[PDB]
Design a protein around this ligand. Structure first.
Ligand SMILES: [Zn+2]
Ligand SMILES: [Zn+2]
Lengths: 329, 328
């Protein structure tokens, strides 16, 4: 009857519902859950250490983790994965092709955002548009005032100036003070209605499938974290958490694959699952290190290149030691 | 003082906001139970467990056409999907759909909502009419499975039980049957047979053509309220219609946001946009007007296939108070 009363903060996803509801339980924990949008969760996690266990920005975690001054230790539960080709909005009236973004003004909400890292990596690795080749403009998407959640020491070849106060990135794109936009959300709707704003990539699905064939990278946005002290005091707690989230994803996938009635409000789910399994592999959204090696390997590289890691991190130091492998029968 | 009602629905994105209280039913204190379709419809039709329940559109229509269904429907279509994916065949025998004339197709029960849409495709598009087929009925996962309600099928429909103890899935695996239709694919052991797969090589493609041609986004499930309840509380149909409506809007609001994709799929952003393109902004519509072509076709097929006792008019499908909602 004696368990750990911990707070747990995650998103509201199919892959977390079975946790939320108790269908999946955490060994030796009595959870207390709060379901949060990413923005709220990471702001609070990084500046306030609200939670015992929390979903976190992979980027932000790495910033603080690279300096051994992060309150949390990560586990390889990738509750957020997604290609971020869809992440890049441009003024189609100006930009014909990605290479045109050299020496333009791109806006982002904060530089160190996980999606932004993957996005800048695409622009570098396959259009030659390097961070330093861009006038960066930082300001909110919906609300005009938005800080960098953690302080950065970016190399000074990265030119970066705040948005005019009171004006969002969304607005600045609308008026075309910036030529481009990257972040985890599209620009605000008023902006979206401008006929001249749209994805850089005309066919993001196609470009991302190519990317994946080329690199084997299914970008990771979010990991999960536990307070350092907690992991030290309870050496089993990392593994326990890893398992639960793992089970929850399996439970949700079990439900999702059933076509008696499709569990998301989309058409063609049957077809999608099978296409996903075809392009990515049966375990298309894997948790776990080995199963994500290419992606992890790339992240540390990009993170260090883009100027957010102290030194170039080793996959081997990214997570709590007890989580680089799970048992099998 | 509210109405203590039991509510039985599936566990979908579009029902979560109901389940967890985010969306509430006017004047009701709901007790929710999340059920797989098979269990829910079995219980709903044969023992009237629930005050409000998701139901087989087909089943409901069977009992509703005889004016002796305990429930009255509302146009909350918590289950929609194309059922091109619904037809598995032995690819080694059936090269194209027309080959199914005079073959043995297996199904779990004849009256099943997806089966109706499926037989309609085979008729409307390949000339394979119900009567042209040796039907075999047995479970997919368990061998013994009753027809939920009695049917008076016209005698041109030849239909026999599966060899006792054997599932449809097995029967397809051994190739005692050439074809299979149902809301679920055959069991996995069967699925491993390299000779089994979809009739349609590109179901998505065929369905998008179908939709261009007909404007039909098949409905599987509606929602239902006990007759007495609707009579005693003339506002209760409308209230329920709204709640489910809001829950779907809430879920769609969450799903469209790309901060983190709420389903475990890749490319959700792209999917949504494609779906909206082919189907319309309200790609998964509740409500009658927005579903007219689909509703129209259903009653037709249902009556053709021999499951409607009377001619049904779209106008008598749902409780009268739900043929329209207000607007600002
Ligand atoms: Zn981020
Ligand atoms: Zn059904």
């Amino acid at each position: 009857m004696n368990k750990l009363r911990l707070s747990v903060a995650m998103g509201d996803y199919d892959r977390t519902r079975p946790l939320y509801d108790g269908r999946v339980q955490i060994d030796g924990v009595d959870p207390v859950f709060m379901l949060l949008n990413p923005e709220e969760m990471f702001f609070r996690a990084m500046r306030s250490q609200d939670f015992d266990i929390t979903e976190i920005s992979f980027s932000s975690y790495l910033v603080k983790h690279s300096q051994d001054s992060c309150p949390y230790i990560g586990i390889p539960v990738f509750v957020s994965r997604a290609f971020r080709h869809t992440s890049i909005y441009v003024r189609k009236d100006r930009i014909q092709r990605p290479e045109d973004l050299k020496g333009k003004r791109i806006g982002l909400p904060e530089y160190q955002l996980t999606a932004n890292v993957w996005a800048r990596a695409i622009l570098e690795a396959d259009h030659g548009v390097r961070p330093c080749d861009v006038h960066w403009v930082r300001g909110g998407i919906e609300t005009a005032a938005r800080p960098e959640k953690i302080k950065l020491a970016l190399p000074s070849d990265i030119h970066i100036e705040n948005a005019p106060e009171g004006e969002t990135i969304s607005a600045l794109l609308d008026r075309g003070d910036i030529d481009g936009f990257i972040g985890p959300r599209p620009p605000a709707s008023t902006a979206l209605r401008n006929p001249n704003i749209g994805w850089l990539y005309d066919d993001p699905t196609a470009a991302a499938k190519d990317y994946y064939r080329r690199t084997g990278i299914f970008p990771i946005m979010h990991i999960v974290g536990i307070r350092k002290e907690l992991a030290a005091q309870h050496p089993w707690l990392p593994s326990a958490v890893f398992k639960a989230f793992s089970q929850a994803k399996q439970a949700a996938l079990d439900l999702l694959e059933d076509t008696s009635a499709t569990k998301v409000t989309l058409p063609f789910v049957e077809e999608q699952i099978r296409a996903a399994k075809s392009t990515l592999g049966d375990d298309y959204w894997p948790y776990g290190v080995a199963a994500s090696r290419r992606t992890l390997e790339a992240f540390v590289r990009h993170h260090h290149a883009q100027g957010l890691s102290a030194r170039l991190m080793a996959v081997e130091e990214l997570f709590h030691p007890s989580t680089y492998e799970t048992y099998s029968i």
